[PDB]
Amino acid sequence: DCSILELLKVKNQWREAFGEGHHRVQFGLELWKRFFDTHPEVKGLFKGVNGDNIYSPEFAAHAERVLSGLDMTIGLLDDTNAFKAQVTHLHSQHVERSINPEFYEHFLGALLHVLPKYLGTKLDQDAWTKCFHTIADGIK
Ligand code: HEM
């Protein structure tokens, strides 16, 4: 359901607050704070990156890596084969970590909760939901 109209919207909007430096840092931080707040239990999966301390340089690194992966896939939504190559790589990086697949819905929930702060009233939740599910399907 992530078709040309949706994927173009999500591209424009993602960059309309995909930034650099501190702007970027604060974003990932608010995303993971919201996620860890709504689902405390998920933190057990992040001990390798110091999930119990989201202000540590280590978890901050992780957060930034996640936004980059997001940036990479979102950018490849209109390029089927390039997209496939990258998510398959993301799949490899999530596959032996025993991630309960419902967690992806909650990650989406967090992301939609924090995006209004950088997009205001313009956030297109439908387009975002459809295209995120394409990405998550790939990762799973
Ligand atoms: C679109 C959604 C997501 C994207 C783009 C994404 C992206 C990434 C990226 C880029 C890494 C770094 C991998 C590396 O360099 O080794 C990573 C690691 C990881 N992700 Fe995700 N991720 C997503 C969703 C999730 C969700 C929903 C969970 C769990 C509920 C999760 C759990 C993990 C874990 C446990 C790691 C490894 C942490 C470690 O290094 O110990 N991810 N992810």
Side-chain angles (χ1 to χ4, degrees), residues 28-42:
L29 192 136
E30 289 171 286
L31 175 61
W32 286 101
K33 193 165 177 273
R34 176 64 181 184
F35 191 21
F36 287 176
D37 168 355
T38 60
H39 294 80
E41 70 268 21
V42 76

Side-chain angles (χ1 to χ4, degrees), residues 35-89:
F35 191 21
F36 287 176
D37 168 355
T38 60
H39 294 80
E41 70 268 21
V42 76
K43 276 192 291 190
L45 295 168
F46 292 95
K47 287 282 170 57
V49 296
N50 207 7
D52 297 342
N53 179 7
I54 63 176
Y55 282 90
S56 65
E58 298 102 303
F59 189 80
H62 167 79
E64 186 163 16
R65 289 199 291 277
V66 172
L67 289 194
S68 276
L70 210 42
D71 180 72
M72 244 144 43
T73 57
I74 286 179
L76 296 178
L77 284 170
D78 47 7
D79 194 286
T80 294
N81 289 285
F83 185 85
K84 305 203 205 189
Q86 193 64 245
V87 287
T88 301
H89 191 69

